[PDB]
């Protein structure tokens, strides 16, 4: 027909790089949104699994979650009720030490004044004694001093027994303070449990987060723009994680493969123009160059596409092809 053009009807649309899609979890397919031949946009849902199980699993965890928030606050009350069972309780024993210590400092000063007087009257006593021995004073004057000294002396150790008695009671109130140091130590023992509870919560929020992933993974969405080259699954099939559900072809992957009789290969060569008419698309002329030639006896020639709507091609399409001789 034309010696400028090798013409052939042995043409196959093929795909170099396709990708297999899978669910990241296992389950029962319940819906198929896309089929063999569909063009799909990155993000589209292709198919969906029954999620009830993964949703139960999540909510089984949300039960146990609120059952650990009904303990966290249960003994956040308990530990803040023992924390005020010692604050108003210690501030009271503190004032009855700051009240005994002032009541004591009142005595220790009246005791000092009395000890002042006793110092003087002791001297008078010594003197008046010596003067009575020598006949230089009446006895009336010396015993007068003597019984004054007796008064001061037993109004003294009245003050000082009234001191060692207000000092043992103080020491007792001060031991009672040490008991509350064992109180807060048992509170901190109760507190080594609160942080081990919100540590069981920290890891539960994580198990939840992971369950919500499994639930989200029940919808198979498309990782890139492409056309569905194969569909391996049907409604009601049980699939496994990572098991192929579709094959997706990157439209840039498409090429035409031509099986050329060796005879009509005369002037054909890598780089040469080529022209493809697929039966599926009468009103479109795909266009390309000869990418490579492999070493009734036909030779496979690979054609790279350079003009025409790639999103329209399907693996397996036939038609007619003209290659330019040189
Ligand atoms: Mg034809």
Author numbering: 27 to 321, 343 to 373
Task: Provide excerpts from the study.
Native aaEmrA crystallised in space group I4122 with a 78% solvent content and one molecule in the asymmetric unit. The final refined model contains residues 27–321 and 343–373 with an Rwork and Rfree of 20.8 and 24.8, respectively. While this domain organisation is similar to other structurally characterised adaptors, most obviously aaEmrA lacks the membrane proximal (MP) domain identified to date in all 6 RND and ATP-binding cassette (ABC) adaptor crystal structures. Therefore, distinctively for periplasmic adaptors, the β-barrel is proximal to the IM, anchored via its N-terminal TM helix. The aaEmrA anti-parallel, two-stranded, α-helical coiled-coil domain is 168 residues and 127 Å long with 11 heptad repeats per helix. The shifts here likely result in relative flexibility in this region, evident as high Cα B-factors over the centre of the aaEmrA coiled-coil (an average of 124 Å2 over residues 102–125 and 200–222 compared to 90 Å2 over the entire α-hairpin and 71 Å2 over the whole structure).
Periplasmic adaptor proteins are key components of bacterial tripartite efflux pumps. Tripartite efflux pumps expel a wide range of noxious molecules, including antibiotics, metals, detergents and bile salts from Gram-negative bacteria such as Escherichia coli and Pseudomonas aeruginosa, and they are major drivers of the increasing threat of multiple antibiotic resistance.
